[PDB]
């Protein structure tokens, strides 16, 4: 059939306006009345990996918001116990999804004293590391050592074990939210029968994968600078070339893959690690360009495919390799030196 069409079960989850439906960056796309006022709080379907908040006293942000020092508040509910919690609590608690899931469900079960009625609710962040469920006293996120209260998010490798979320997160999270790169991939849309690279929104070489995981995730979703909600939009993917350290993002949703060895093609809710990657799908075939096409003013379009019959090729046909489905083939205006 068409790209779209054999690519739509694997892509659903790369449509983020979808699969989470909320501010990535910064997440406060729902709003509830406690009492007599509105306020607003994050509803996004997906937990994001590697997001922490980085705070103006310089404290992590999981330190309790009541710490003794005020240099040692962070963003965490108080002592006065709700949290955090252990993955093994919430086990015997009769919770019954993964650990993610579980902490999504016990920040969705904690009610604000000040009215028992609200259908307001914290965000989480759970530690896979630490195997704990912290639960946020506030939903602040970004906010222009200073105080607490000066903050902005931000996507770190090092803590790519830690997953914020809202109470809202999918049951099945990691089935439907592009949760990890995608190995020896470039994201596309299908074009005239082949699956066509998107064109970069802006583009920068950086060290490694995580740093691009970083520059991107800077510029996704954001549920601020009612009407200041992203619905997901944003820009919430990227392709990281391992090979030149080229990190394109980009804004169009992706609906196909072209396969590349080296490239890894990332989200801003997914892992930032290379190591966290998923081998490209080789079951699923198509004719893909490599190269986007920009407006421009100004030769030979690289092709690949995972079959010959697929590839689309008006000169030499080569033989790659490829960890994710070993090799693969590619057009190209060199002779091969097999020849
Ligand atoms: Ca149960």
């Not at 902490?103 to 989480?124: L, Q």
């Not at 530690?127 to 931000?154: G, W």
């Not at 919430?236 to 993002?249: E, F, H, I, Q």
Request: aromatic content about 10%; some cysteine.
């Amino acid at each position: 059939s068409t790209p779209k069409d054999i690519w739509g079960r694997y892509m659903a989850k790369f449509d983020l306006a979808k699969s989470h439906g909320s501010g990535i960056y910064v997440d406060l796309g729902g709003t509830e009345r406690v009492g007599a006022t509105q306020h607003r709080m994050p509803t996004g379907k997906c937990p994001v990996m590697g997001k922490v908040i980085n705070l103006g006293n310089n404290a992590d942000f999981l330190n309790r918001i009541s710490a003794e020092n005020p240099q040692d508040r962070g963003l965490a509910f108080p002592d006065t116990i709700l949290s955090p919690v252990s993955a093994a609590d919430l086990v015997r608690w009769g919770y019954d999804g993964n650990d993610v899931a579980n902490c999504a469900e016990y920040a969705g079960n904690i009610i604000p004293a000040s009215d028992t009625a609200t259908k307001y609710r914290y965000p989480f962040v759970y530690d896979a590391k630490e195997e704990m469920c912290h639960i946020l006293f506030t939903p602040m996120q970004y906010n222009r050592t200073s105080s607490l209260l000066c903050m902005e998010p931000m996507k770190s490798g090092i803590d790519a074990h830690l997953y914020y979320g809202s109470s809202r997160v999918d049951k099945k999270w990691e089935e439907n939210c592009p949760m990890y790169p995608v190995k020896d991939a470039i994201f596309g849309r299908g074009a005239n029968g082949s699956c066509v690279a998107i064109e970069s929104a802006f583009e920068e070489f950086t060290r490694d994968a995580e740093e691009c995981s970083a520059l991107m995730f800077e510029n996704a979703a954001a549920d601020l600078e009612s009407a200041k909600n992203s619905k997901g939009v944003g820009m919430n993917w990227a392709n990281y070339d391992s090979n030149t350290g080229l990190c394109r993002v980009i804004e169009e949703t992706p609906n196909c893959l072209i396969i590349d060895a080296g490239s890894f093609a990332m989200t801003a809710v997914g892992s930032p690690l290379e190591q966290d990657a998923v081998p490209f799908p080789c079951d699923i075939v198509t004719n893909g360009y490599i190269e986007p096409r920009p407006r421009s003013r100004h030769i030979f379009e690289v092709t690949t495919a995972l079959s010959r019959e697929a590839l689309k090729c008006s000169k030499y046909v080569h033989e790659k390799y490829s960890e994710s489905c070993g090799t693969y083939y590619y057009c190209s205006e060199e002779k091969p030196s097999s020849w």
